[PDB]
């Protein structure tokens, strides 16, 4: 399928144990997509002070369109030293590995895969 319905656990930035997906734009997009397929991906909501507490390159989920079955359609955009790889809508949050942190909420998305 071109899209997959996922329910992403929303993590507090100070709880996150693994603060990025790797060391290059291509690796972080690869690892993010693998962790989304495996159900091991968390979401941190971006506010003042969040991104400096995480590791670059960043992987964002961005709104791809204006929401089937309650799931916002999203795609991945990576960022490294102020340059984005991908073009999309509003940021829903930054993706991180999930390794058992307790979430505060779930974000229902339809991921363009």
Q: How many angstroms is the resolution?
A: 1.5
Give the Å distances, CA to CA, from 51 to 3, 14, 19, 76, 95. Answer: 27, 11, 10, 16, 11
CA distance 34 to 82: 24
Identify how the structure was determined: X-ray
Per CATH, the architecture of 3-112 is what?
Answer: Roll (2.30)
Q: Which residues in the chain belong to E strands, given as ranges?
A: 3-10, 41-44, 58-63, 72-80, 83-85, 91-97, 105-112
- How far is C-alpha 91 from the chain's CA centre? 9
Q: Taking CA 4 as the corner, what is the angle to CA 69 and CA 103, rounded to the nearest 5 degrees?
A: 80
Domain boundaries of the chain, sorted by first residue: 3-112
């Amino acid at each position: 399928k071109t899209h997959v319905q996922l329910s992403l656990p929303v993590l507090q930035v100070r709880d996150v144990l693994v603060r990025g997906f790797g060391d290059s734009v291509e690796e972080v997009l690869s690892e993010a997509r693998q962790h989304l397929k495996d159900g091991t991906c968390g979401l941190v909501e971006v506010e003042k002070g969040v991104l400096p507490q995480l590791e670059q390159p960043y992987v964002f989920i961005k709104r791809s369109d204006a929401a089937p079955h309650g799931h916002v359609m999203v795609e991945l955009v990576a960022e490294l030293e102020g340059i984005q790889y991908g073009r999309s809508g509003e940021t829903l949050g930054v993706l991180v590995p999930h390794v058992g942190e307790i979430p505060v909420a779930y974000r229902k998305v339809l991921l363009r895969k």
